[PDB]
């Protein structure tokens, strides 16, 4: 197994968050109206300030968070930003519960998946090692040579494993022939391995931060396939065993015990809680008494549905009240006009694309009928059409035309209706 | 190490009891200490008595009321009215249904954690007085002729948490099933500092669940079990050794079963299959006193296509006794909430557990629970010296509940604002 | 395989009818009121009586019994009147329609070990047989020793036989070295055996009466686990084989052809009838054909149900047609106030709890208002009540404050409902 | 595999050299007649002497020893000598040659097991260690408990292994749950050992000398039954394999290594060599080549032998002449008379023996006539005689009846040809 991985972030979920940096809440726990990414929704922004620092002192006991509210709200971006108010590097993985809904693959395995990639593990070790040749005890690489001068102790340390002049050694700080001597006679099975090159010493800082299905792809392979083409190479993922995992979970627990390494558990937002049924909420709560298990923020636009698994019994939000229970229920308004035009500037300031006032305001008169999410979608196509004038600076009607060439689901539906 | 039966989540910390009379059965406000509720208490009481040399014959009690009562804080009751060392297992019934395991599975486990072997057998207990207690992200303890520091994890830490045990506590430590037993108190029961050697070996007795049995002769459940694809069933071999074993040692007489307590909450959940080995189990001479809460009166029989009180086959309800809880006064509110608060750590104003109190009525109590802790931290970053009402008010402006919760949502789409609309 | 086995009878179930004897009927078969532990009820009594008249005389050819009442009538006690009427030791397996549903085992499966639990099997047997080393012939044991006068036949039947002098041997009346020459040299294999201890002679009658299921569970071992910790040993009983019933059942036919043993087909009562689906009835029908089968009496408590199995086909008491064809259907009536007092003071003088009259009618009071049973339950709760004043003698307070520590099934929904 | 064992050492063969201690030479290697045993034969010593001398001075390369005269002369007493010369306890291994004549063993495999029987290996190790129960760092035993002073190299030294407080450890100066906590709930399999009992330090010194030999047997068995009835076990003795001895051999090395142990090459002493074969003397001829082989001293009683594998090849002793190069040849002579009853008078002063002096001349005079190993045995028989009339001391008339009851080999064979 490897111990530095790369890490492929699902960044297509982020995309319309990049503005959001945090919740711009001041020293008092106040949240401030336009800051750090955030447009007003200062209940919402305070109650979340509260739950960061419920976390942070380890009050959360066992619960989660529910953010209620409709979809032009930003319940995702609030999530995003309890992740950037928990630390540095901290694991944020969102989904929606219609993605547990998996063909061959079990619904709680998806949430175990999602799990894995909402828990952390902080990597900084200051490694020392001087490698090489041995001399005398003296070492030498590809281009370098050095003379160590050894206390008896570290060669009484030395008698133990199998070493002699000159085999290739490695040197632990804070806690075997060289290839030069191999005959064409010998070939295999042989001892003989190639001297460290090219440096005599050896002394780096491991810096990193990985979660556990960074880990688990990583290990999946005996090219990267699986983050190369992830669902179109097989219908069956059938890399990612249970052996490999807790021989993972094995090696991570290792790193660990030698105060190398910190597992953080970050924020596992699910969008479309109602969608879950009562065996992941069973799996739910059997994760709320994990104590190194990452803050679970559930979402929903809806105020009573039917719980999944149940006899149509309707609830609050599809929420099972053994599992309501455990929840901090945040609510989150809709905008005022004003408001949309802040944050319809914010976006058009990060895509980004020059557009008038004008503009603004008819895109937020878009943000007020229809989603905010379709009037920001807006944006792209009304740049485009403006491009193509050469106009390089959007007008109202670029963006009316792109209202009228990209309708909104209602619109779509309802006209497709007569 | 291994594990004892204690081992009681446990976010009743307040229940020695039922507060009852010994003899007159009779319930006493505020004892053990649990408020109000005296019916059903004291109901409580009369069922235990026909429970020791019992005409009940294997019968499972019913507990059915309104949400946020003391129908749970009642079971915990009637777990302590058998004593300490007395398995006692929760359980929510929708956690009956996953993937991990099946149903039979998690009844089987249910079951086996709510039967106890004792047993007599020789471990090394420490006995002393504790000098110091830290917190992380160490105790130290002395007697009269040594003085030492041990290391502890997380189950230790909230063993010993959960005994209410602090600097100046004379305690004992099992080093073989970490069961804490407090003693008394050297200062301000005032027991003195012992002496001799801190760790001795005595002959004590060792109760332990059937499933923790299982448990320890298995596979220890690796780190991150529950991320990792690893279920949780037992696997059929180890639990026959187990059954086999215990049966020798109750035929020899090292070993004497004691049953205990399983809770399912909100049993309405279960459906007939769940029922049918839940009264194939309560057959069995070493079946536990299984106790089930009801918030809902009327509920559909899961698997049929009928319906019955609080969702009970017709047969089972036949054979259970029932016991009712109730509504509570405002003073009992408070006097809970105020329970509540000083195990939080939680120092209210006056105003604030009113208010608090108030909250109770509307929404629950187990909302104004959620409020307490909330209102701690708005107090402490305002760097207030007492969580005021306005905290409270702040908390409650901040996290809504449930019916708020849904009226809000429903908000986006209004229903009348000059006449109703539809 | 073991013949004399013990058998652990569900006596949970029959706890309320210890009272009942029989059936209380006169030599011209009319039901006497306030006979045999039965009060009232003689239309169905007599019924009954009607019923075992006819099982004893063949004539009940594939035909069962439905008993159709209320909650507050007594259907298992006449079916336990009935099991009572149809001899001394007979067979009696009361179930609901609800125990068919199991978790990991199938309805026929648990309907077919209660058909195991309904018919059993009568041993009585006068075996007589002298056993012991011989000496001459003659034989010796532990402490005592005979000389048996051999004629000439038995002594030709004994030189079929590995039998000298001298080994240790076995005589049927009716119809291998000894361990004293064993050394230390041979250990095993050996054919050294224990001599006979410490009887010469071995003259025993074997009388017994067990089940079917008796026989199964005592040769389901290699302790009694599956008697001590029955569903709570491991979630699927694994130890009853098809192999083992069916080695069983050629045991039991090789008992019947001696004369040893005569199986006696028991009752089978089966509450909730309505709850059955119709493969459960196609296997009760493949049942009712067979003579070596219990007699099946069905009971209910509704109308019409709709038949589990079909599409919505409502019928008579959940029962399907082609199998209600074959049942003799026997109502069983409410009861009178006067009745309920006489079979309150019954079981609280077998409980046995010493009462007031007047107790007895606020007991009965709730037999009328609610189900008989609940108010047969409110006898325990008070005595204790009463005892906790060291009264010993329980009063209407004591009535009085045990009905409102324990509602009945609606009382508490209704109360719930505010 | 164990590191001390036990040696049982063939005392059959030198019950007749107890006598001999060494060769009784002086500083300037001149042989002292009648000195530490021996008596006479000053020449053979003294040659003796320079062959212990070579080998000494590493001089002796790839020769070995010859030793050729009659049955009367000493030469086992003479290769005994030897290996007394070379040192303290180094092994002695006396064989003849038609020894390697098994039934069902190869003679070379006989050869290859009496060169392990003749190659010792001297274990001298000062073994100190401190064992226990961690209870902080101190340690515990049965009875008694010690608080060791660590500094941090080993404390880091420490930090590799399992060691937590309080589990069993081990610690090396010059270079695991504790049963306590068991439960009864754990059985196997466990991680719970013993507390070492009962000393709280274990400093030891580890003194040895055992042959290859000795570790082979030691390592044969999974009750020691191969010293307790060696060839009357088994007809062949299928327990040292070649696995086993490889097994030993890496161990022996292994041992070398760390400076623990120091293996001797011995004396392997081979009487009547001229019954070895060419492929015998080709083995030996490969041992020569050896660094770490025992010196090999051959001896014969005759002449000219034909060599054993060829045709009718008559030489020197039976010994084919590539192998006869590469030996030193020491002539032995016969003894005087008065030689002969200095010999006898030392030999029946160690049985010991109490005769007069005309008893030993009429024993001497057999000694002349007969072999001197013949005259030697009638010690004994006339002992017993003499003590049978209870004399206790040994006359002529004695040994006399004793020459007369017991003949030698030529006496008895042409006795019994009339
Ligand atoms: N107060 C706010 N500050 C900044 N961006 C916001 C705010 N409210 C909504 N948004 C943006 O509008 C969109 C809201 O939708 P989203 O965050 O995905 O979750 P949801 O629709 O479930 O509440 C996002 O693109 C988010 O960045
Ligand atoms: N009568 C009571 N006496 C003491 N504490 C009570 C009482 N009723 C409720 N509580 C406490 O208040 C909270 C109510 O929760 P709980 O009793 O578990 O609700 P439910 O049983 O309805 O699911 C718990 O912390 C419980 O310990
Ligand atoms: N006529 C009767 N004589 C005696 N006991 C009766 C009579 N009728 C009812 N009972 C008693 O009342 C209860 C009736 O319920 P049960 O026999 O179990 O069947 P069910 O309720 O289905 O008719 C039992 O305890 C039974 O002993
Ligand atoms: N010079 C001597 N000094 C002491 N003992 C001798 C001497 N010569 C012979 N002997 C003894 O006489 C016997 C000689 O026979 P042995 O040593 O077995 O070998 P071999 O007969 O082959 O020369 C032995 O018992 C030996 O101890």
Not at chain 1, 30 to 53: P, S
Not at chain 1, 258 to 284: K, N, R, S, W
Request: hydrophobic content about 40%; glycine content about 8%; proline content about 4%.
């Amino acid at each position: 197994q490897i111990s530095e991985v790369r890490g492929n972030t699902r960044d297509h979920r982020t995309a319309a968050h990049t503005h959001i940096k945090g919740l711009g809440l001041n020293s008092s726990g106040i949240a401030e109206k336009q800051a750090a990414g955030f447009v007003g929704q200062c209940a919402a922004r305070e109650a979340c300030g509260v739950v960061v620092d419920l976390i942070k002192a380890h009050k959360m006991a066992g619960r989660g968070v529910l953010l209620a509210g409709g979809p032009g709200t930003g319940k995702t971006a609030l999530a995003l930003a309890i992740s950037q108010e928990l630390g540095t590097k901290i694991p944020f993985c969102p989904i929606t519960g219609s993605e547990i809904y998996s063909t061959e693959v079990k619904k709680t395995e998806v949430l175990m998946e999602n799990f894995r990639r909402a828990i952390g593990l902080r990597v900084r070790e200051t490694k020392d090692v001087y490698e090489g040749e041995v001399t005398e005890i003296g070492l030498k690489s590809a281009r370098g040579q050095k003379k160590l001068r050894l206390d008896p102790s570290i060669y009484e340390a030395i008698q133990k494993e199998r070493v002699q002049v000159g085999d290739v050694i490695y040197i632990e700080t804070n806690t075997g022939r060289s290839d030069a001597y191999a005959t064409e006679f010998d070939l295999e099975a042989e001892e003989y391995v190639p001297i460290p090159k090219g440096e005599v010493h050896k002394k780096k800082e491991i810096v990193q931060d990985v979660t556990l299905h960074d880990l688990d792809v990583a290990n999946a392979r005996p090219q990267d396939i699986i983050s190369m083409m992830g669902q179109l190479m097989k219908p069956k993922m059938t890399e990612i065993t249970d052996k490999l995992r807790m021989e993972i979970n094995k090696v991570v627990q290792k790193y660990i015990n030698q105060g190398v390494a910190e597992l953080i558990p970050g924020v596992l937002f699910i969008d479309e809680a109602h969608m879950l049924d009562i065996e992941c909420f069973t799996y739910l709560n059997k994760a709320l008494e994990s104590p190194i298990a990452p803050i679970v923020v559930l979402a929903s636009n809806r105020g009573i549905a039917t719980i999944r698994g149940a006899d149509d019994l309707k609830a609050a939000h599809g929420i099972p009240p053994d599992f309501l229970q455990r929840l901090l229920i945040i609510p989150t308004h809709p905008y005022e006009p004003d408001e949309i035009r802040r944050i319809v500037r914010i976006r058009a300031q990060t895509e980004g694309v020059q557009l008038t006032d004008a503009a603004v305001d008819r895109v937020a008169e878009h943000g007020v009928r229809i989603s905010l999410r379709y009037c920001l979608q807006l944006l792209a196509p009304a740049s485009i059409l403006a491009r193509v004038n050469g106009r390089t600076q959007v007008d109202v009607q670029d963006i009316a035309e792109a209202e009228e060439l990209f309708l909104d689901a209602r619109r779509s539906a309802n006209i497709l209706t007569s | 190490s291994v594990t004892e039966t204690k081992e009681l989540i446990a976010a009743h910390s307040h229940i020695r009891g039922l507060g009852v009379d010994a003899d007159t059965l009779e319930p006493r406000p505020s004892s053990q200490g649990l408020v109000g509720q005296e019916k059903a208490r004291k109901a409580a009481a009369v069922v235990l008595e026909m429970i020791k040399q019992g005409k009940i014959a294997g019968r499972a009690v019913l507990i059915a009321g309104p949400p946020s009562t003391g129908k749970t804080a009642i079971a915990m009751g009637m777990a302590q009215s058998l004593g300490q060392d007395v398995p006692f297992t929760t359980l929510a019934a929708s956690e009956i249904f996953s993937l991990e395991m099946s149903k039979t599975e998690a009844l089987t486990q249910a079951f086996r954690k709510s039967i106890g072997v004792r047993i007599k057998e020789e471990s090394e207990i420490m006995e002393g007085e504790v000098v110091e207690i830290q917190i992380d992200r160490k105790l130290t303890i002395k007697t009269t002729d040594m003085e030492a520091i041990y290391d502890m994890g997380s189950k230790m830490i909230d063993a010993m948490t959960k005994e209410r045990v602090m600097a100046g506590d004379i305690i004992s430590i099992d080093k073989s099933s970490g069961k804490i037993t407090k003693l008394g108190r050297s200062y301000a029961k005032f027991l003195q500092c012992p002496e001799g050697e801190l760790q001795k070996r005595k002959e004590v007795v060792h109760t332990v669940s059937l499933h923790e049995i299982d448990v320890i002769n298995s596979r220890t459940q690796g780190f991150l079990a529950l991320f990792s694809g690893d279920t949780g069933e037992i696997r059929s071999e180890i639990r026959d050794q187990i059954n086999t074993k215990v049966a020798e040692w109750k035929e020899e007489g090292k070993a004497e079963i004691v049953p205990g307590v399983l809770f399912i909450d909100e049993v309405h959940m279960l459906d007939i299959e769940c029922f049918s080995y839940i009264n194939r189990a309560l057959e069995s001479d070493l079946a536990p006193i299984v106790i089930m809460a009801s918030n809902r009166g009327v509920s559909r029989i899961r698997g049929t296509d009928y319906k019955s009180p609080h969702g009970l086959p017709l047969d089972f309800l036949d054979r259970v006794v029932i016991i009712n809880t109730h509504p509570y006064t405002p003073d009992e509110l408070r006097q809970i909430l105020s329970i509540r608060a000083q195990e939080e750590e939680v120092d209210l104003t006056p105003d604030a557990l009113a208010l608090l109190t108030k909250i109770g009525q509307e929404a629950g109590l187990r909302y104004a629970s959620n409020l307490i802790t909330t209102s701690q931290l708005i107090a402490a970053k305002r760097r207030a010296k007492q969580v005021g009402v306005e905290d409270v008010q702040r908390s409650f402006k901040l996290f809504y509940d449930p019916a708020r919760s849904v009226r809000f949502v429903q908000e986006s789409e209004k229903r009348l604002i000059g006449n109703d609309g539809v």
